[PDB]
Amino acid sequence: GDDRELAILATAENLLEDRPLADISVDDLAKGAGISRPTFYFYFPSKEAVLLTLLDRVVNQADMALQTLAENPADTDRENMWRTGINVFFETFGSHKAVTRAGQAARATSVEVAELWSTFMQKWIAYTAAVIDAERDRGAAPRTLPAHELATALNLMNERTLFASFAGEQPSVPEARVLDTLVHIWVTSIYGE
Amino acid sequence: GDDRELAILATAENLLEDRPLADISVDDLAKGAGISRPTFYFYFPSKEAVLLTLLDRVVNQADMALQTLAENPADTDRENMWRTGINVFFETFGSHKAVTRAGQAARATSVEVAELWSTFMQKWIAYTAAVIDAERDRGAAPRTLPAHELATALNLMNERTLFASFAGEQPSVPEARVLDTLVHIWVTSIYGE
Numbered sequence A, B: 001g002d003d004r005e006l007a008i009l010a011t012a013e014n015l016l017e018d019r020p021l022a023d024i025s026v027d028d029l030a031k032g033a034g035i036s037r038p039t040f041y042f043y044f045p046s047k048e049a050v051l052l053t054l055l056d057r058v059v060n061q062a063d064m065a066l067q068t069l070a071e072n073p074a075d076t077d078r079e080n081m082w083r084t085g086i087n088v089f090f091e092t093f094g095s096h097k098a099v100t101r102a103g104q105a106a107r108a109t110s111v112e113v114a115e116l117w118s119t120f121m122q123k124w125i126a127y128t129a130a131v132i133d134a135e136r137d138r139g140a141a142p143r144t145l146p147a148h149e150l151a152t153a154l155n156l157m158n159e160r161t162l163f164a165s166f167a168g169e170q171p172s173v174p175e176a177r178v179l180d181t182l183v184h185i186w187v188t189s190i191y192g193e
């Protein structure tokens, strides 16, 4: 039951490492999961819904990891605290590059994937502004830009920069340099007067 | 000749303000330009090539404006110099929102649009790193991150942030705040130790 479902999700993730969603048929997903086509439709309405679930799981795994961090402050300086938080997204999306890339391309065409991404980005930007506000309240960061607008651009930068790096786009920051790069932009823009 | 061509480009830009490229037919472009369908095919191989030309013109207009600025230093402080440079992209792409949005969505599917965007982004990132390097050489900015990687993330941030603002995406920086927002990120990340 949940096993036939996981089989179908695991096949689509393995297949997405090789071709885009358009070059993958329901029969490919069925065959790979060891089931027939009509049995597939019992678990998912379409291959698009398969992607939606995969992205849902990846986005929830990132969100849960960040919530864990939030309730368990790392005992370290400010720069390292932002690094560990950004690293949650670098490791989680960077461990699922194929879903990340397919999820990103599906935003243009799927309302559900567009709204999932948007809900979570709003949540992650609100958390980022809450932390900047705490930092200003404590006297550790200066009152420069509106925190929420600062948070928005910094989260958009990470979405675009992480994802260009993972896809190996031309241009992009190499993946072994993107964490340092982004932490520097964050710390100087949050703390710089 | 060049007039029938401009008519077709002007119709596609006006139509793209209302629906996406998929909801626009060659007959719509022809009718709007006052020509037949076979006459259309004489000037463009497809409606996709129409978009490619429109984006080409917008990208070249931005690049030319920036080159003008480069050969005509504005007599002002560092923050205002970055502001005027980013403003070239805010005004040029912000005066062509429909083409910008359609050009962006076409990157997923059109190799030509993907390579146009990439060539120009490489050029704009190289210029940005050349300027950061000049700034460090003169003793005005500290030697922090590799300039070219810094330039890459800052240009990716602007592409994503400008474009979310222009499309009114949820989340996005409001369009009357995005220039200030980005200049602050740039100046603190370039000059901050």
Ligand SMILES: O=C(NC[C@@H]1CCOC1)N1CCCC1
Pocket (backbone or CB within 6 Å): A066, A085, A086, A089, A090, A121, A124, A125, A127, A128, A155, A158, A159, A162
């Ligand atoms: O790096 C990111 N954000 C890291 C921020 C730092 C702490 O919470 C969010 N993101 C947000 C969407 C894709 C990548």
Ligand SMILES: O=C(NC[C@@H]1CCOC1)N1CCCC1
Pocket (backbone or CB within 6 Å): B066, B085, B086, B089, B090, B121, B124, B125, B127, B128, B155, B158, B159, B162
């Ligand atoms: O804001 C941008 N760049 C501004 C930089 C500042 C000076 O030259 C480039 N971009 C680059 C692509 C889309 C928007």
